[PDB]
Amino acid sequence: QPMIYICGECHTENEIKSRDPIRCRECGYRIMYKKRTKRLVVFDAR
Amino acid sequence: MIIPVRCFTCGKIVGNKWEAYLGLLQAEYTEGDALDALGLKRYCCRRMLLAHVDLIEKLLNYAP
Amino acid sequence: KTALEMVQAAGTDRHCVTFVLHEEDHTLGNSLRYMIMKNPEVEFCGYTTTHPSESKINLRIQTRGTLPAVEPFQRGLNELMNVCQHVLDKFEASIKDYKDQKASRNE
Amino acid sequence: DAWDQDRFEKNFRVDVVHMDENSLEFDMVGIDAAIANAFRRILLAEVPTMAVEKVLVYNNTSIVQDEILAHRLGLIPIHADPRLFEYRNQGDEEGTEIDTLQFRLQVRCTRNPHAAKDSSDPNELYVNHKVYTRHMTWIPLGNQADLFPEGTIRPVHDDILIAQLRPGQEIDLLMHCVKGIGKDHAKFSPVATASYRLLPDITLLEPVEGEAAEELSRCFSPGVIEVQEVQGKKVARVANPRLDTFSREIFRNEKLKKVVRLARVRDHYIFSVESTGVLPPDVLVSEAIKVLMGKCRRFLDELDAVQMD
Amino acid sequence: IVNKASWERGFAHGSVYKSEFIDLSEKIKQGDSSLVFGIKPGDPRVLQKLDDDGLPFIGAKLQYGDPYYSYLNLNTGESFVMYYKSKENCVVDNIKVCSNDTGSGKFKCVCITMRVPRNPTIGDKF
Ligand SMILES: [Zn+2]
Ligand SMILES: [Zn+2]
Numbered sequence: 001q002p003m004i005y006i007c008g009e010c011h012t013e014n015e016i017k018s019r020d021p022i023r024c025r026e027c028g029y030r031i032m033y034k035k036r037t038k039r040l041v042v043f044d045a046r
Numbered sequence: 047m048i049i050p051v052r053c054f055t056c057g058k059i060v061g062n063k064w065e066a067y068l069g070l071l072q073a074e075y076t077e078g079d080a081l082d083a084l085g086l087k088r089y090c091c092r093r094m095l096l097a098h099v100d101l102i103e104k105l106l107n108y109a110p
Numbered sequence: 111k112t113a114l115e116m117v118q119a120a121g122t123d124r125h126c127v128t129f130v131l132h133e134e135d136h137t138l139g140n141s142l143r144y145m146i147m148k149n150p151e152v153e154f155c156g157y158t159t160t161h162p163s164e165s166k167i168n169l170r171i172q173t174r175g176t177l178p179a180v181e182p183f184q185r186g187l188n189e190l191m192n193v194c195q196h197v198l199d200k201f202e203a204s205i206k207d208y209k210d211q212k213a214s215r216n217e
Numbered sequence: 218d219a220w221d222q223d224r225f226e227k228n229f230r231v232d233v234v235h236m237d238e239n240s241l242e243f244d245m246v247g248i249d250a251a252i253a254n255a256f257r258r259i260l261l262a263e264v265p266t267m268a269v270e271k272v273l274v275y276n277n278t279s280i281v282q283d284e285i286l287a288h289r290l291g292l293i294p295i296h297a298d299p300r301l302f303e304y305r306n307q308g309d310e311e312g313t314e315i316d317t318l319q320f321r322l323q324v325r326c327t328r329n330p331h332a333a334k335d336s337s338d339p340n341e342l343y344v345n346h347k348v349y350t351r352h353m354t355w356i357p358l359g360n361q362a363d364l365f366p367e368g369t370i371r372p373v374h375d376d377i378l379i380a381q382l383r384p385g386q387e388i389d390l391l392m393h394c395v396k397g398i399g400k401d402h403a404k405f406s407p408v409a410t411a412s413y414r415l416l417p418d419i420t421l422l423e424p425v426e427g428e429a430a431e432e433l434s435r436c437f438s439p440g441v442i443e444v445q446e447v448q449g450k451k452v453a454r455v456a457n458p459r460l461d462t463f464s465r466e467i468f469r470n471e472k473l474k475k476v477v478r479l480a481r482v483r484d485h486y487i488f489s490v491e492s493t494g495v496l497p498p499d500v501l502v503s504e505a506i507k508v509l510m511g512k513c514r515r516f517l518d519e520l521d522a523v524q525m526d
Numbered sequence: 527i528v529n530k531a532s533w534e535r536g537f538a539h540g541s542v543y544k545s546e547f548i549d550l551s552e553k554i555k556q557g558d559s560s561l562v563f564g565i566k567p568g569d570p571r572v573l574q575k576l577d578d579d580g581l582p583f584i585g586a587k588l589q590y591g592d593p594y595y596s597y598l599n600l601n602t603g604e605s606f607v608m609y610y611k612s613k614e615n616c617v618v619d620n621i622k623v624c625s626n627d628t629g630s631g632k633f634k635c636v637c638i639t640m641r642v643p644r645n646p647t648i649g650d651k652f
Pocket of ligand 2: 053055088
């Protein structure tokens with residue numbers, strides 16, 4: 001899958017390839033976060 | 047933020063005494079008896095539950 | 111890998127030797143200091159931790175009347191085994207007297 | 218005088234006061250501070266237990282941070298018998314059947330579909346919104362399902378609020394319980410607190426009557442000094458001076474600070490061991506006595522290794 | 527003197543959130559300003575450390591010497607790489623992708639936010 005980015009306001013998983021302008025494709029909002037996916041990171045319980 | 051699992055000074059498990067503390071306080075107990083009737087005897091443990099501001103109900107309002 | 115260093119004082123003087131016990135603190139260093147001082151053949155027995163960043167103790171033992179100072183230290187250890195063994199045997203047989211009074215009281 | 222072993226084995230006695238689950242109170246007549254403190258300091262730091270060390274996260278979408286969640290899982294008591302397990306030799310990430318235990322805290326929060334009318338209560342709106350420790354699934358590896366029955370390897374308290382969730386948020390981690398002593402990190406200690414106190418004595422050097430006995434009756438703790446009627450007057454007699462907090466309140470009143478001699482009884486310690494639940498409390502005092510013997514045996518083995526003679 | 531076990535149980539544990547607004551035109555300017563974040567396929571420097579867009583993962587720990595972000599010059603195809611040149615160890619908390627004030631900015635602004643643990647050590651003043 002491509003990378004998934006979440007808008008700040010309406011929270012839609014808008015995929016952004018690195019070419020097109022960056023905006024939410026529903027409400028046009030300009031700041032978009034990034035989704036957290038499965039991968040392994042080891043933290044110690046100390 | 048959220049209640050610590052162990053008391054800081056001497057490590058009594060006090061993390062399992064928070065919801066049953068709010069339950070005693072809604073049932074019109076006082077805080078001198080809602081810390082007595084949970085088994086918190088030393089004032090280093092009664093410090094941990096009396097003085098605790100559960101700052102995660104305010105923090106979860108900003109939810110996606 | 112070692113756990114015990116004997117340091118003679120002047121090489122020939124085996125009456126004064128400072129036992130440097132590795133991986134220790136005031137748990138065994140103060141229980142041994144109580145037992146070696148219960149020997150009349152010991153003029154002086156004191157311990158110190160080296161530095162709290164380290165975990166080894168010094169343990170000075172020095173005797174009178176010409177004993178090498180490992181014999182109050184073997185007697186220092188065996189007479190603590192014989193104390194913890196007796197504390198264990200009077201503890202495990204006093205818990206059982208408590209359990210068998212909690213059972214046979216109104217049950 | 219010297220160490221008469223038959224003076225010790227005649228005057229020593231242990232008197233157990235209270236022992237329910239996860240608590241113990243006993244006396245020790247005739248042991249000195251340098252042994253009783255060794256028992257106390259072996260309970261707090263030498264008796265080994267099991268606790269979480271590594272945490273392998275996938276999708277901590279929660280509000281509790283990835284670091285703080287691992288530290289919060291470290292402090293949760295595991296109800297595994299420590300004596301069954303071994304220390305990890307250093308550098309193994311995946312321990313064997315004998316070294317490590319495993320768990321898996323896999324909780325996903327979702328909205329409650331039904332019975333969600335005009336309410337803002339979280340129990341009626343959300344499912345799995347308070348991640349308790351009863352959400353931990355023991356994942357036995359090797360042949361550990363055969364050594365322990367169904368329901369032995371387990372978190373102790375099963376009410377400890379780990380995280381708190383809202384819908385869309387997920388915790389999918391994996392744990393690795395290890396073995397350690399209570400001084401390598403404080404999460405391995407078996408005991409809430411282990412302590413002692415000398416039994417106080419209180420000695421009425423003067424017979425006090427009347428209202429001065431009631432004034433004496435309230436300086437000490439409730440239950441120490443009792444006021445009894447003997448033909449019209451109210452004289453005071455002590456009764457169980459174990460109850461006294463030793464707060465020195467009688468040395469504030471002026472006329473009555475010279476009638477009682479508040480001191481302590483030497484070598485009459487009153488322990489109290491409160492376990493966190495990993496082992497029963499009278500098994501933790503046994504495996505704290507048996508550690509000081511091991512510390513003696515290791516140095517006797519080293520003395521046998523130095524001098525062959 | 528602070529108790530050691532009490533320090534180990536959670537006494538005054540903290541965090542410090544080093545956020546860093548990264549812009550590919552206010553800093554990196556050589557030619558034509560067509561710099562978007564991206565990885566060139568066949569680059570071993572970004573294998574499993576940076577994501578397929580050139581930004582690091584969320585939750586991924588960073589240490590001194592890790593690839594920090596990578597940006598793909600769109601006109602030639604030659605992707606670069608920038609490394610995490612801080613001393614401390616940190617965890618990428620979230621990454622926000624900022625556009626311009628119109629809504630038509632190209633994918634070249636970002637603001638990485640990093641947790642740094644910062645527990646009480648020797649020399650921390652109370
Ligand atoms: Zn939007
Ligand atoms: Zn406490």
